[PDB]
């Protein structure tokens, strides 16, 4: 067992830290000496460009940006499916020339947000100042890729866009956000052997849900274990374990419209 020593990264997240809980704690078997590096996702899009660790978490949008050096793992995929990340305000209004907040350049929801509004401002911004940035009038309107997707309610924000409805309207497939990276330089003995201990984290994850999203209440931001326990089931889950064949057409299809349109 060669280069058996590598560097996971993952996100400070509930739906991570839920699908991750079993590896972190020693509950998955592997002959893998694995060191875990916990990044905001955007943060990993970036330092992905160097090809810096061995797996990483990366939204799909920033994968067409790496390919070359890194490919998709079946496993640990984020997919959207009737859901996914939204653009809230104040009240209604058009987003068209409005100043939106958005987490990172890189994310897939910022694609989909430039593919549904060809034309506004968006303020680039850590996640954790979007909702403040909006109740404060900071900006028109902000971009929420995690649990503010589901709580946005809570402040008397209202979806503006729904990058799902959008979505939907163009493809009819799940919407992949974001996606499990190994690096290509690793033996094939390595990418089975992490893929098999990664399945095996999901999958434990479902069959125990409780102790699973006890953990992961460390990243839960205010949610109580219920809602936290629907976001981390709402990104972990089937396509999670095994991307099907229909995520994969769908990705294909997010990048064909991302080159139309010279987002790429």
Known sequence: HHSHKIRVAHTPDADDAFMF???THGKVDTWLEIEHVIEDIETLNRKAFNAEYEVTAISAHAYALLDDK?????AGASVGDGYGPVVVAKSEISLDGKRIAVPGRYTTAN???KLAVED??????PFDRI?????????????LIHEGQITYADYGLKCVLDLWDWWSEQVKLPLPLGLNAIRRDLSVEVQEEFLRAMRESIAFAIE???EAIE???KYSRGL???RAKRFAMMYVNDYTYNMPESVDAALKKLYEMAEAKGLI
């Open 21 to 23: 809980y079993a590896m």
């Open 70 to 74: 890194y490919r998709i793992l079946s």
């Open 111 to 113: 694609l989909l947000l």
């Open 120 to 125: 506004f401002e968006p303020v680039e911004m």
């Open 131 to 143: 909702i403040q940035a909006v109740l404060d009038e900071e900006v028109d309107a902000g971009l």
């Open 208 to 210: 125990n849900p409780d």
């Open 215 to 217: 953990y992961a209440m």
């Open 224 to 226: 109580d274990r219920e």
